[PDB]
Amino acid sequence: RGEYVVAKLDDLVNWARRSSLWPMTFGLACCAVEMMHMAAPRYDMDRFGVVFRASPRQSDVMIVAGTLTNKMAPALRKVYDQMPEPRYVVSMGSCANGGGYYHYSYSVVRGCDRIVPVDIYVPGCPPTAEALLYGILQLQRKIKREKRLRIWYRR
Amino acid sequence: TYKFVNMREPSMDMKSVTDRAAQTLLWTELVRGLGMTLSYLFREPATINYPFEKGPLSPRFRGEHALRRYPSGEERCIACKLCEAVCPAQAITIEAEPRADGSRRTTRYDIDMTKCIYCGFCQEACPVDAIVEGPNFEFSTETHEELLYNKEKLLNNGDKWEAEIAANIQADYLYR
Amino acid sequence: MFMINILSLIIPILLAVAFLTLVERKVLGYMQLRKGPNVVGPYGLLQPIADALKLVTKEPLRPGTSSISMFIIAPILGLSLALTMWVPLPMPYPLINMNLGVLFMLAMSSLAVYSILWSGWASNSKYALIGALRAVAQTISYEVTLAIILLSVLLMNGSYTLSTLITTQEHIWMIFTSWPLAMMWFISTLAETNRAPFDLTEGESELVSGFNVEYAAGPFAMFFMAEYANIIMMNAFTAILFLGASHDPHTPELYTINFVLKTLALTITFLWIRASYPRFRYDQLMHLLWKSFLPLTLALCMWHISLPIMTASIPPQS
Amino acid sequence: MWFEILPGIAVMAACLFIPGMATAHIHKFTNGGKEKRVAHFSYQWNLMERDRCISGVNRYHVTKGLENID
Amino acid sequence: ASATRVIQLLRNWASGRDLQAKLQLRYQEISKRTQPPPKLPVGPSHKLSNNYYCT
Amino acid sequence: MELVQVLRRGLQQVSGHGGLRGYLRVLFRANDVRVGTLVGEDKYGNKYYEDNKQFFGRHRWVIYTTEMNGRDTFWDVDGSMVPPEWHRWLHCMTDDPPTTKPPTARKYIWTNHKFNVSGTPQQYVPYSTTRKKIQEWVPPSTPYK
Amino acid sequence: RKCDPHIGLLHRGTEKLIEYKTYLQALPYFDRLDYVSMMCNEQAYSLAVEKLLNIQPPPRAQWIRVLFGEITRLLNHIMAVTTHALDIGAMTPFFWMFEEREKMFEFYERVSGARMHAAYIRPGGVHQDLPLGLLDDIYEFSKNFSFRIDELEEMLTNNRIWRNRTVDIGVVTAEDALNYGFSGVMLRGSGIQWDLRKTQPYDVYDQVEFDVPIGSRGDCYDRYLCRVEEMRQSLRIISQCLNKMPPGEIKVDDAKVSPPKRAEMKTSMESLIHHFKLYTEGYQVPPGATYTAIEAPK
Numbered sequence A: 001r002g003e004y005v006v007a008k009l010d011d012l013v014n015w016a017r018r019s020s021l022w023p024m025t026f027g028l029a030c031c032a033v034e035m036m037h038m039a040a041p042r043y044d045m046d047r048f049g050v051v052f053r054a055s056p057r058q059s060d061v062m063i064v065a066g067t068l069t070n071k072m073a074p075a076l077r078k079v080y081d082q083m084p085e086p087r088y089v090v091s092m093g094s095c096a097n098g099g100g101y102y103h104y105s106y107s108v109v110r111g112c113d114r115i116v117p118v119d120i121y122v123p124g125c126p127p128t129a130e131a132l133l134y135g136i137l138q139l140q141r142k143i144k145r146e147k148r149l150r151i152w153y154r155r
Numbered sequence B: 001t002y003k004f005v006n007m008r009e010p011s012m013d014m015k016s017v018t019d020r021a022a023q024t025l026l027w028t029e030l031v032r033g034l035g036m037t038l039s040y041l042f043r044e045p046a047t048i049n050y051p052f053e054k055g056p057l058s059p060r061f062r063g064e065h066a067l068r069r070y071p072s073g074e075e076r077c078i079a080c081k082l083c084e085a086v087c088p089a090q091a092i093t094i095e096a097e098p099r100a101d102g103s104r105r106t107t108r109y110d111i112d113m114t115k116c117i118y119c120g121f122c123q124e125a126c127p128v129d130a131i132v133e134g135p136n137f138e139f140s141t142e143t144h145e146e147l148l149y150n151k152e153k154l155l156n157n158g159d160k161w162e163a164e165i166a167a168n169i170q171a172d173y174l175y176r
Numbered sequence C: 001m002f003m004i005n006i007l008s009l010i011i012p013i014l015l016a017v018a019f020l021t022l023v024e025r026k027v028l029g030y031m032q033l034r035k036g037p038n039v040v041g042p043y044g045l046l047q048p049i050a051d052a053l054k055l056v057t058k059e060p061l062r063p064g065t066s067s068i069s070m071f072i073i074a075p076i077l078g079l080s081l082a083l084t085m086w087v088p089l090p091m092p093y094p095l096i097n098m099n100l101g102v103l104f105m106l107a108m109s110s111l112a113v114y115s116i117l118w119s120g121w122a123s124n125s126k127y128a129l130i131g132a133l134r135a136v137a138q139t140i141s142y143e144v145t146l147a148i149i150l151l152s153v154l155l156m157n158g159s160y161t162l163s164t165l166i167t168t169q170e171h172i173w174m175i176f177t178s179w180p181l182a183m184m185w186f187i188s189t190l191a192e193t194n195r196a197p198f199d200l201t202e203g204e205s206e207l208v209s210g211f212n213v214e215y216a217a218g219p220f221a222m223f224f225m226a227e228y229a230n231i232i233m234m235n236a237f238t239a240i241l242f243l244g245a246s247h248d249p250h251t252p253e254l255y256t257i258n259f260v261l262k263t264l265a266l267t268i269t270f271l272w273i274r275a276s277y278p279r280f281r282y283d284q285l286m287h288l289l290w291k292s293f294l295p296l297t298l299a300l301c302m303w304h305i306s307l308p309i310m311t312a313s314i315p316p317q318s
Numbered sequence D: 001m002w003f004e005i006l007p008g009i010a011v012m013a014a015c016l017f018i019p020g021m022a023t024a025h026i027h028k029f030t031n032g033g034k035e036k037r038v039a040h041f042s043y044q045w046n047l048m049e050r051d052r053c054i055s056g057v058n059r060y061h062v063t064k065g066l067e068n069i070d
Numbered sequence E: 001a002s003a004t005r006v007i008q009l010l011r012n013w014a015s016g017r018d019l020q021a022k023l024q025l026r027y028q029e030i031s032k033r034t035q036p037p038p039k040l041p042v043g044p045s046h047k048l049s050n051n052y053y054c055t
Numbered sequence F: 001m002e003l004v005q006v007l008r009r010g011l012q013q014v015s016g017h018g019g020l021r022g023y024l025r026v027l028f029r030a031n032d033v034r035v036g037t038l039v040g041e042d043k044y045g046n047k048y049y050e051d052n053k054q055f056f057g058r059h060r061w062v063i064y065t066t067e068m069n070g071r072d073t074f075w076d077v078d079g080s081m082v083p084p085e086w087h088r089w090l091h092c093m094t095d096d097p098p099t100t101k102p103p104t105a106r107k108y109i110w111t112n113h114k115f116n117v118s119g120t121p122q123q124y125v126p127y128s129t130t131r132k133k134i135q136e137w138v139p140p141s142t143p144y145k
Numbered sequence G: 001r002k003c004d005p006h007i008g009l010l011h012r013g014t015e016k017l018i019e020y021k022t023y024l025q026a027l028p029y030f031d032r033l034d035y036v037s038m039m040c041n042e043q044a045y046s047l048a049v050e051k052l053l054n055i056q057p058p059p060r061a062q063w064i065r066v067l068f069g070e071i072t073r074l075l076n077h078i079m080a081v082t083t084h085a086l087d088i089g090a091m092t093p094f095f096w097m098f099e100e101r102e103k104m105f106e107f108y109e110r111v112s113g114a115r116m117h118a119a120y121i122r123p124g125g126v127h128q129d130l131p132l133g134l135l136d137d138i139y140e141f142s143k144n145f146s147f148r149i150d151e152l153e154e155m156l157t158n159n160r161i162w163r164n165r166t167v168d169i170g171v172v173t174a175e176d177a178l179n180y181g182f183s184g185v186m187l188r189g190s191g192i193q194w195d196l197r198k199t200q201p202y203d204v205y206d207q208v209e210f211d212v213p214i215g216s217r218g219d220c221y222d223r224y225l226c227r228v229e230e231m232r233q234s235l236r237i238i239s240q241c242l243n244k245m246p247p248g249e250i251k252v253d254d255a256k257v258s259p260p261k262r263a264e265m266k267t268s269m270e271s272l273i274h275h276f277k278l279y280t281e282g283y284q285v286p287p288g289a290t291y292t293a294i295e296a297p298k
């Protein structure tokens, strides 16, 4: 039946997307250091299929790791625009989540969500590299639960 | 006491210069560089098998905030507002009101995880060990609003991680 | 079944290129005390298929300032030439037994730079144009020595046909006769394939992604196809030239196994050097050759010109 | 602990194996078992053309020796 | 997570040093994750007399 | 000599994991084939192994349960599937497993360790936990006028 | 020809928010200032506040401070050299030494409870004492760290590629460096014999014995060699601190600048009152101004 065929196509495409999540080298602050430590041998992003890649044209997930300030927010929004779809935003740290320590400052965006649609909120100051890996795996399951071709079949 | 890190003049004996020319032509330190990486590939990798294998922690680890309670069942919090008055990020909001029994307990105890800095200052300030930073750190959420913790959510965390948090405090209270 | 042979020289080559990415991300990672791709199935044997699927279903945006026509013709040029230059290789019996295989492969290798050229210029970017010019300089500098070294080495072959190399190295590897040139040749194979430590056309640290910076999804995967097919073909050519192997006319499978093993070893050394060095700085990789490689290779060219004559060892042309 | 690396080469080796054998086998199949005759010079091509002519069935690989002549 | 003797010689020769003596992986030499309870000392002002804060 | 023993214990790898079928089960699920002493098991089904010979970090590990709280976890697993009592032992925060040293029991402690409830309709929605502050006049009902 | 740096792309109003927070509340700000060297920032702030308060931390607190400052110097130098090689192009030493960096993060978390932002060094000493059995682990790690340093040297020191991208690349004159406000390595790397650990010793730095790696040419290669030698000398200082740990308390025995012990707070009137006031109001610093600086790993 057509539903089974589109189901299997959904599983294949979602598996590819979740098993080759290519992130972006967009570290901003101390939350980037853990972003490096999970790339360090101990946790090693590489075994999970995730390999760092600059040039947003060839990346899927943006881990906004660090404080997002007013002077940088236009750059972050523009760079998010460069990403071809599908795209995902993982927010690392309290600063990139809702403001963190400098939530009441004059030149800090009170949450990265106000600029891009954040897909996964990873809490911490900074989050432990295990916690960030957990957030990435949660995003992976999110991609696994996508129903693109199913919705197309029931257009 | 100081040392000259790069103050070495190379010897100009015929043997020395022959060795330098051999290293230049027949790449020698380059071969050493290859050999080092060969030696480490043959070595054991350091990666752990997350999530089936977890990196080591300590009983002092700071994670998800949680409200504890006495063994009787009554909450430890008495709304003294030390944690709210000491939080560097002003992430705690407390509203108190005398309960029906008479004990002073928070009618609202909200901790904003999206604004928290996980310093642990609240758990030091608490005179009754009511608010603690639990061992949990894998509590990422898909939406922002789920990170704005209420009193009920914090009490649920306290009731859930109580087995771990009681042991962690038991193994660390003597240092404090 | 000539079509059968042509398809058998394309699909296996593409599969080998796909698994080259996995073996690179594993060998490199094990250099760096990591484990490399491990989750997808057993030992990551599905990563090439996974990211292959992603790159051909991810949205292939076209920049508003691009030049559409060349932006599209460049990936086709790159992949077509990378695949075509596999046909004259004397894997037991070459598919296309050309009388001038070496010159043909030199011509197509020189053409392959034009893919980089047109892709960089048509993308309308500062980084892309920078990378295109670095590619210009790198490939011209290294092409001069490529041609001279090929002449010097093949002077003992007697002609430019690739198959006779097997006859030439019947009793001894050619590397024992021209080990100096071989070193230089290896370095040239590192640079013409635009790999480390000469991968300045991409320059991930300083040029973000170089000439692939505006290339997304399918065209990017295709330029990667061209690059890795060129890597494997260059290592195969180096194995054919210097590290000859025994060839039983009745069982060509023995020569197939030996040749494949030598190509695998040469490629593994490519990934080895990629993970053990810093990166060159533009002019240096030029000043390395125009001032150290070119004079030495000219002298070796004169030496190998004279050598058959002084020893009465001129190889036959037939 | 690099034996996990080994499968990647293994299958890849098979990949690099597939053409080298196939062409050879094809050269044996389409030319009657024997090696494909290579014409690097006009003399070899003339020999091949005369073989095609003598064979009578218009295939050069089909060879005739003493039985053909009287 | 131990290498064979043949491998150890290859690693040692490729590096030129005894790697087995000083490894970057902690096997058993680490301190036990469970430790006896400590008794912290007191400071120099935990006196019951002549301890006026003016001084 | 060590080559032969090395080839041999690769067969103890398949023998320990309940034969070939269990060998591919653990290989495809937990991505490892290494064996270890069964330190314990929790009420949710996760199996808890330890091997002190492994270097610090992989001396203890979990094979997660196939099913927990009405959710198939044969293929998808996460770090929140660890019950609180065993999370201490797994993360090397203690050397006392719950089997030997069990955590103190109390009424308010839960009896079913819910995993990360994000995504599922059992999410957490923030809301004000306080009553009203200003009341209204609630005008009378008699027309009167 | 010209290279204008447009900083401010990460300008958090730290020096503005600090006023609105008490001295204890402002402590975590410095941990978040420099995220590769962390306990050094807290050490500088604590020294400033202690000098203003006219109090001194206990000797054990000073020794813990210098030990963890040298650990932090190890962290920062590892980051600097490894990411430097990555930017030049060599990426393997980054991972190789970041394994060790995770090993030191383990010490950070075991002592303070957080991997990165310890908030450990505080005005008056340190928060809590070292967990039992930590000196042994530090000794075990520092015993093998020399091999990793030597491997990094063998990877970068004599390579003709690294020795060409860093030799005579970015030379600075001595007087130009002094006038430009440079400090730390960029003085030590250009012949200027200056180091705050020796010239103006703070804490107990006048006890440990170490050598300052004075540079020669002032280029990038000389500064990299200086950083590696600073790593080795800091390893020596760590060995000395491990071998000379004194008994005593962890904070100044004054309940008006350091919170009382949790056992004393729940039993005695004065401890409870002082804990309440310190965690609600804080210690009143006498009026005045000071400028205190330390040889941070940068």
Ligand SMILES: COC1=C(OC)C(=O)C(C/C=C(\C)CC/C=C(\C)CC/C=C(\C)CC/C=C(\C)CC/C=C(/C)CC/C=C(/C)CC/C=C(\C)CC/C=C(\C)CC/C=C(\C)CCC=C(C)C)=C(C)C1=O
Pocket (backbone or CB within 6 Å): A025, A026, A027, A028, A029, A030, A032, A035, A036, A039, A045, A046, A051, A052, C011, C014, C015, C017, C018, C019, C021, C024, C025, C028, C029, C047, C048, C049, C051, C052, C055, C221, C224, G083
């Ligand atoms: C000082 O402060 C600093 C900060 O302070 C705040 C900072 O923030 C930052 C900034 C922060 C960062 C940069 C973050 C940190 C980043 C890192 C540490 C980087 C870590 C990187 C890694 C772990 C990964 C490195 C990568 C490696 C080792 C290898 C990569 C190589 C690859 C090959 C990857 C794979 C990619 C690709 C494209 C391959 C896949 C493609 C295929 C297989 C295609 C296959 C296709 C087929 C088979 C097709 C087949 C077709 C067939 C058969 C037929 C077709 C025909 C038809 C007709 C259809 C810095 C630097 C900083 O310094």
Ligand code: SF4
Pocket (backbone or CB within 6 Å): A029, A030, A031, A065, A066, A067, A092, A093, A094, A095, A096, A100, A101, A124, A125, A126, A127, B117, G032
């Ligand atoms: S959330 Fe904490 S660690 Fe992350 S950038 Fe903000 S202050 Fe730094």
Ligand code: SF4
Pocket (backbone or CB within 6 Å): B065, B083, B086, B087, B088, B089, B091, B092, B111, B115, B116, B117, B118, B119, B120, B121, B122, B123, B133
């Ligand atoms: S640990 Fe969290 S809740 Fe407690 S004071 Fe620090 S930021 Fe506030």
Ligand code: SF4
Pocket (backbone or CB within 6 Å): B076, B077, B078, B079, B080, B081, B082, B083, B084, B094, B122, B125, B126, B127, B128, B129, B130, B131
């Ligand atoms: S410090 Fe403790 S007792 Fe006081 S209000 Fe906060 S949680 Fe309640």
